[PDB]
Amino acid sequence: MQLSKAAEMCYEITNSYLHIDQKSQIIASTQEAIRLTRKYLLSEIFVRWSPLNGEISFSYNGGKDCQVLLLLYLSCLWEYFFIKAQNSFPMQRLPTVFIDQEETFPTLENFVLETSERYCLSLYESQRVNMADAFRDFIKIYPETEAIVIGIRHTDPFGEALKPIQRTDSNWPDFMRLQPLLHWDLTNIWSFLLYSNEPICGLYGKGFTSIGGINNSLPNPHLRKDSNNPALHFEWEIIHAFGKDRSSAINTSPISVVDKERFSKYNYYPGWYLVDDTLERAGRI
Ligand SMILES: Cc1cc2nc3c(=O)[nH]c(=O)nc-3n(C[C@H](O)[C@H](O)[C@H](O)COP(=O)(O)OP(=O)(O)OC[C@H]3O[C@@H](n4cnc5c(N)ncnc54)[C@H](O)[C@@H]3O)c2cc1C
């Protein structure tokens, strides 16, 4: 859809989530994570750089984390338009960067393309090694790029020293890292993404909890059905998902035939049956 419509839609979704009045530590926690992310964007980021004209590019790889961020970002883009009108919708696409690699799952590539069309992203896609170099090439093509939005957060307990607004290290080309999802935990991610009713990468439906490349990521061994029985913690969000109101259906994207072959050897609960952040990357490495 056109960008103004995507932005207004995401605004309604986020607003609707913020109006959930349920007994729930998860919901209340996620409402707080939403408010902080939106405060970073509206109060610290969009005040300093334009989210429309190319000063900022959004790094998007179709994963759950940058998808949640993209929905929040679009919600803030809607609000930004009115704030700037108040202090003084364009027909265009949102500048976005996707690094495509040889080991990228086709299912994910397809999801990136489809959601680029849904959210009206103007996609730069690299030609299918090291991410630092991929971005160095990007910045050389688009030197006006001042900042890049990154859906990074803490997914193991180890010290990382990340900040919401942070310069790249000297290894990397110079631009500002914008990392407003940093305080989200795994339960917040699933609660919001399932509530949104937006389509999500079909790999999560097959037991992935973290998506890498074909060779470095698998369904989460802790979701293997014959040896684990996790409870569903997001039933309310699923049943009452935005605009849904078949209540129990989850909007997963199609698995590419090649990936279906690759996964035939796999007996796994969907990713949203994992809430233990310590175990999020267990299917990786
Ligand atoms: C734009 C950018 C700038 C970075 N700058 C530094 C730096 O200065 N110093 C440093 O030590 N490390 C830097 N990194 C690496 C980063 O800190 C993480 O160590 C690395 O991304 C792996 O973390 P992760 O596995 O948790 O998340 P990842 O799986 O890498 O995902 C984290 C986020 O990065 C973006 N991303 C990941 N893969 C892609 C892709 N293929 N295409 C487009 N976006 C993608 C998405 O927004 C995603 O939400 C940078 C990474 C990116 C993407």
Curated annotation (Swiss-Prot):
Reaction equation(s) it catalyzes: FMN + ATP + H(+) = FAD + diphosphate
Major subcellular location class: cytoplasm
EC numbers, comma separated: 2.7.7.2
Molecular-function GO terms, alphabetical: ATP binding; FMN adenylyltransferase activity
Pathway field: Cofactor biosynthesis; FAD biosynthesis; FAD from FMN: step 1/1
Listed SUPFAM superfamilies: Adenine nucleotide alpha hydrolases-like
Gene Ontology biological-process annotations: FAD biosynthetic process
Keyword annotations of the record: ATP-binding, Cytoplasm, FAD, Flavoprotein, FMN, Nucleotide-binding, Nucleotidyltransferase, Transferase
Pfam families: PAPS_reduct
Alphabetized InterPro entries for the sequence: PAPS_reduct_dom, Rossmann-like_a/b/a_fold
UniProt subcellular location: Cytoplasm
Binding site for FAD: 59, 99, 151, 169-172, 177, 281
Cellular component terms (Gene Ontology): cytoplasm
Protein family per UniProt: Belongs to the PAPS reductase family. FAD1 subfamily.
Note: FAD1 is essential for growth.
Chain's role: Catalyzes the adenylation of flavin mononucleotide (FMN) to form flavin adenine dinucleotide (FAD) coenzyme.
Name recorded for this polypeptide: Flavin adenine dinucleotide synthase
Organism: Saccharomyces cerevisiae (strain ATCC 204508 / S288c) (Baker's yeast)
Gene name of this polypeptide: FAD1
